[PDB]
Amino acid sequence: DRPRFSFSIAAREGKARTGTIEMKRGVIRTPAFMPVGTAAGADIILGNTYHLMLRPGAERIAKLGGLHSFMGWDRPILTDSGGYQVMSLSTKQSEEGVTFKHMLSPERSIEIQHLLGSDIVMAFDECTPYPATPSRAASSMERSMRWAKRSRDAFDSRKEQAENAALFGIQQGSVFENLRQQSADALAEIGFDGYAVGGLAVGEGQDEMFRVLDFSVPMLPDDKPHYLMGVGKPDDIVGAVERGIDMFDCVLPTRSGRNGQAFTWDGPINIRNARFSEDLKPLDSECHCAVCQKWSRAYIHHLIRAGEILGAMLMTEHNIAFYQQLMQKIRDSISEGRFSQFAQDFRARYFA
Amino acid sequence: DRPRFSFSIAAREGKARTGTIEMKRGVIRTPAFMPVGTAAGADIILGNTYHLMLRPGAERIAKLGGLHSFMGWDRPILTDSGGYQVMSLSTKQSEEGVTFKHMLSPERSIEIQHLLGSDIVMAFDECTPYPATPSRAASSMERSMRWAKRSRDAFDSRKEQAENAALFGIQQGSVFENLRQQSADALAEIGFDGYAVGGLAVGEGQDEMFRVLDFSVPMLPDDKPHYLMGVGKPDDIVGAVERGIDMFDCVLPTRSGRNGQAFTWDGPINIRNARFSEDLKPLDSECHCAVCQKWSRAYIHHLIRAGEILGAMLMTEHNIAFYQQLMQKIRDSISEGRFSQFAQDFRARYFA
Ligand SMILES: CNc1nc2c(CC[C@H]3O[C@@H](OC)[C@H](O)[C@@H]3OC)c3nc(N)[nH]c(=O)c3cc2[nH]1
């Protein structure tokens, strides 16, 4: 019988790691990509806390048997704490939490995630806007750390949650090394099952994001998983793995899939472009997905140009599969000690 | 090795028949429902002649290897002749054909269908508007019969087509028994592989459509398949089979699937309605489709209300599967001599 939570590192290359997270509902191979659950293989999917709390509401999801039953997915599910989305899509902040057009607090966030039944629960934090002054970044991070402790206590007070789920803390501090360190120290003192790097993929760009990861990831406990929230493009994922990240989520595969963009080893392509109208090659030359086994760029181009939902579905299936093949290649290369070479080869071809 | 075309009737009950059409690319079980090819089991699918001739053009489809290669479907394909769609969606009529914003003639229609590579080719006809006066219905039908002969000759002049495909003639005559008879006589004199009842499902309503079928279908050769163009709702299909129809096509399963409507044995439902928000039953209680095996009305309701493409896809998959289960039940009941009872039971429950 699998444990509630156990992370094991099987192999390393530089800062990169590959291994497994064992949970009651399944094993998660790392580095992992975690796709949106409602998108359409993956070891864990995402539940959309913000949407679900509004429609149909967390209490209603619980009445229906929880997210696993509702979505027909019996493996692990990760949920965010909801605040990022409230601040992005809705607001009034206070030490208690956020009110918006209801009150979302650390305690309420944890309870919502309990009612949804997720396996990996995120602490309720504040994703500091970018750019931020040192003072504002510090005040924001300090509040997030107080909220992390409140999240910890709320999670621990719910027996079913404490015994069956896992809780990740989220590091903040914007782009400032000293604040990232204080945040890491605060989170480690509280103690979490995993640690996320928050506050990135918010407009800073890849060079700056990588610079922040360079010093931020080593601050987190080495023996726990590291989750980079909101990342990202394939090249962002590769560089983040090079910097010690184990888990990823991004809206790109689905957003791109619904908007004519396909990921390939030769970079992204816009399938609507006329240059694909007579292209009999599959979306990607090496991809093993069902779409690439059967249909051409020309046919998918045709479907999308005709407004056929089948086209968007095939694009999305391909993009999700591409991301999973990327993660498999990353895991295999780290395990074989050839990840550095893989990263180099990947970049040379993707950006050719 | 299968013949070019062979229709065999295995069993009858009243005017209803069940059997098979054998063609080089496969066997078609009748009564048959023929779904849109780009929708997402079926023995034959439809190619959209009108759309294809505009985007990317029939010549381009031929360059890409024909529709079978293009769509990844190696079984039979049926194509319409294009005029119905031109008159519905675009016009100037003449004895030569129709010009619209190009000229579509019987000869050009047959050539387009040849370039697409379809297995069942429809004659180029005029679908008379409804209502029509006797004079206008007669003039229209007479032109369609001249065009049927031209279609026959064009098809026969193309070796690959004549030897590998089949040609159906289309009966016209509006709602008038004498014109339907003249049309049937003209088509039988020319000689076709199958016979369609055209000019219906154009606003006349079920009672009138059934009245016209009552006298029109017996006018067609008994030993050839009968295709009712544009029909229809499940109850229309059942009543048409009771009147001797063997083949069907309809935009309903896909249009409904993309617009929140699901077909069930208890009638259609609009899954967006709030009454489904907590309904844990599958879309239909008896349906064997993949969707009903796995997901609830509540989840599909959620997906569609959230604007998720997955929702529309699941609805469409279910509707297509429902239609195929309907046709299987029809075939089985005729073969077992219990179709009358099936039709009665079907109606009692569908309209309860
Ligand atoms: C895009 N960049 C980005 N996203 C971010 C998210 C949302 C991820 C969440 O976004 C949802 O997708 C819309 C996913 O559900 C995911 O949750 C698992 C963040 N969430 C929290 N709690 N804290 C952060 O610092 C944070 C930073 C982010 N940067």
Ligand SMILES: CNc1nc2c(CC[C@H]3O[C@@H](OC)[C@H](O)[C@@H]3OC)c3nc(N)[nH]c(=O)c3cc2[nH]1
């Ligand atoms: C809706 N009612 C209806 N449709 C009709 C169609 C289009 C079927 C065609 O419609 C396309 O779907 C948009 C399908 O491709 C199908 O072709 C196989 C007809 N086509 C011809 N040639 N002649 C007729 O008398 C006719 C009557 C119809 N009544």
Ligand SMILES: [Zn+2]
């Ligand atoms: Zn693929």
Ligand SMILES: [Zn+2]
């Ligand atoms: Zn079903």
